[PDB]
Amino acid sequence: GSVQIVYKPVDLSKVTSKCGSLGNIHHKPGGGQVEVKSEKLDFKDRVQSKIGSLDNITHVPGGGNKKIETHKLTFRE
Amino acid sequence: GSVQIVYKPVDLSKVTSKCGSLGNIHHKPGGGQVEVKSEKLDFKDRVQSKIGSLDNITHVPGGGNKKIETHKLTFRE
Amino acid sequence: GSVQIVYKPVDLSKVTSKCGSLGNIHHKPGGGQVEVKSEKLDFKDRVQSKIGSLDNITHVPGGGNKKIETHKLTFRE
Amino acid sequence: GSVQIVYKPVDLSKVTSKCGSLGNIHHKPGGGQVEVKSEKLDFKDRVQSKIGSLDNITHVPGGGNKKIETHKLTFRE
Amino acid sequence: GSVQIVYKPVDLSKVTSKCGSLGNIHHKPGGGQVEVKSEKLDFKDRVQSKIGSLDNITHVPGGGNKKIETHKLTFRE
Amino acid sequence: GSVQIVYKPVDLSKVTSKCGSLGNIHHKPGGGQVEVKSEKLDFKDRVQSKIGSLDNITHVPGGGNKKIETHKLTFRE
Amino acid sequence: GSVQIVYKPVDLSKVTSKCGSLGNIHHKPGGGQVEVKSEKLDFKDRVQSKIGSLDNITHVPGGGNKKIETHKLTFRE
């Protein structure tokens, strides 16, 4: 016997923004307080962690568009 | 016998925004207080965690559009 | 027998922004306080961590667009 | 005519405490938020004020006894 | 004519406490929020005020006894 | 005529404390946030004020006793 | 005529403390945030003020006793 696979996906797509101005943004936090008492840790595989954080962000992109996109073709006898 | 697969998806799509201004934004938190007492940890596989966080964000994109998109073709004998 | 795979995905896509100005941004945090008491650590494989952080960011790209994109073709006898 | 005033108050009093221990005291407040918009002020005579306070106290005297005591003798022709 | 005043009050009094221990005290408030909009103020004589307060106290005296005590003798022709 | 005033108040009083220990005291506040918008001020005579405070205290005297005491004799023709 | 004033107040008083130890005291504040917008000030006579404070204290006297005491004799023809 025989197999034939043809895989020809097309994408002419568009992701876009326009904006006149971003302007007055104020991020102004009064500071907190944290504590943790985690005695014994054992992390193995692909782990991510935070422990005891007190972190502030201000993220102001003039356009933060994103296009996440995956293909997979798999064949097994 | 024989098999024939043809896979030709098309996308001419569009994701869009327009905006005149973003303007006056104020993020202004009075600070809290956290505690945790987690004695013994054991994380194994693909784990994500936070423990004891006190985190503030301000995220103001002039267009935050997004197009998440996956294909998969799988064949097994 | 025999197998034939043809894989010819096309992408003419576009990710875009326009912006008139970003302008007045103020990030101004009053400082907190952290503590951690994690006695014994054992990290093995692909681990990421933070422990006891107090970190501030201000991230203001004049366009922060991104296009994440993966292909995979796998064949097994 | 004539006047005679004699004024001889006596006090042998006592104010007292005993205590074995004061011990474990924890004062641990998560932080609030205040605002005031008082446009025009005019304070004249013997005034005390606070405006817009956010104040924490912890007052632990090993004996906080007090004896407030006033005399006044006044004579007018 | 003539007047004779004799004023000889006596006090042998006592105010007292005994206590074995004060011990475990926890004062632990989650933080509120206040606002005031008082446009025009005019305080004159012996005034006390607070306006817009958010204040926490913890007052743990090992004996907080008190003896407030006033005399007054007044004579007028 | 004639006047005779004699003024001989006596005080053998005592204010006292004993204490075994003061010990474990923890004062640990997560930080708040204040604002005030008081445009025009005019303070004249004997005034005290605070405006816009965010103040923490910890006051732990090993005996904080106090004896406030006033005399006044006044004579007018 | 004639006047005779005799003024011989006596005080054999005592204010006292004993204490075994003061010991473990921890004052540990996460930091807040203040603002004030007071355009025009005019202070005249005996005024005290604070404006825009963010102040922490830790006051631990091994005995903080105090004896405040005033006399006044006044005579007017």
From Swiss-Prot, chains A, B, C, D, E, F, G:
The modification N6,N6-dimethyllysine is found at residue 8. Phosphorylation at serine and threonine residues in S-P or T-P motifs by proline-directed protein kinases (PDPK1, CDK1, CDK5, GSK3, MAPK) (only 2-3 sites per protein in interphase, seven-fold increase in mitosis, and in the form associated with paired helical filaments (PHF-tau)), and at serine residues in K-X-G-S motifs by MAP/microtubule affinity-regulating kinase (MARK1, MARK2, MARK3 or MARK4), causing detachment from microtubules, and their disassembly. Phosphorylation decreases with age. The modification Phosphoserine is found at residues 2, 21, 49, 53. Glycans are attached at residues 44, 50, 66. The modification Omega-N-methylarginine is found at residue 46. The record marks 8, 14, 18, 28, 37, 40, 67, 72 as: Not glycated. There is a cross-link at residues 8, 14, 18, 28, 40, 44, 50, 66, 72 (Glycyl lysine isopeptide (Lys-Gly) (interchain with G-Cter in ubiquitin)). It is found in: Cytoplasm, Cytosol; Cell membrane; Cytoplasm, Cytoskeleton; Cell projection, Axon. Expressed in neurons. Isoform PNS-tau is expressed in the peripheral nervous system while the others are expressed in the central nervous system. Changing residue 34 to M: In FTD1; ultrastructural and biochemical characteristics indistinguishable from Alzheimer disease; accelerates aggregation of tau into filaments. Signal peptide: none annotated. The modification N6-acetyllysine is found at residues 8, 14, 18, 28, 40, 44, 66. Tau/MAP repeats lie at residues 3-33, 34-65. The tau/MAP repeat binds to tubulin. Type I isoforms contain 3 repeats while type II isoforms contain 4 repeats. It is linked to In Alzheimer disease, the neuronal cytoskeleton in the brain is progressively disrupted and replaced by tangles of paired helical filaments (PHF) and straight filaments, mainly composed of hyperphosphorylated forms of TAU (PHF-TAU or AD P-TAU). O-GlcNAcylation is greatly reduced in Alzheimer disease brain cerebral cortex leading to an increase in TAU/MAPT phosphorylations. Frontotemporal dementia 1: A form of dementia characterized by pathologic finding of frontotemporal lobar degeneration, presenile dementia with behavioral changes, deterioration of cognitive capacities and loss of memory. In some cases, parkinsonian symptoms are prominent. Neuropathological changes include frontotemporal atrophy often associated with atrophy of the basal ganglia, substantia nigra, amygdala. In most cases, protein tau deposits are found in glial cells and/or neurons. Interacts with MARK1, MARK2, MARK3 and MARK4. Interacts with PSMC2 through SQSTM1. Interacts with SQSTM1 when polyubiquitinated. Interacts with FKBP4. Binds to CSNK1D. Interacts with SGK1. Interacts with PIN1. Interacts with LRRK2. Interacts with LRP1, leading to endocytosis; this interaction is reduced in the presence of LRPAP1/RAP. Promotes microtubule assembly and stability, and might be involved in the establishment and maintenance of neuronal polarity. The C-terminus binds axonal microtubules while the N-terminus binds neural plasma membrane components, suggesting that tau functions as a linker protein between both. Axonal polarity is predetermined by TAU/MAPT localization (in the neuronal cell) in the domain of the cell body defined by the centrosome. The short isoforms allow plasticity of the cytoskeleton whereas the longer isoforms may preferentially play a role in its stabilization. This is Microtubule-associated protein tau. It comes from Homo sapiens. The chain holds residues 621 to 697 of 758 of the full protein.
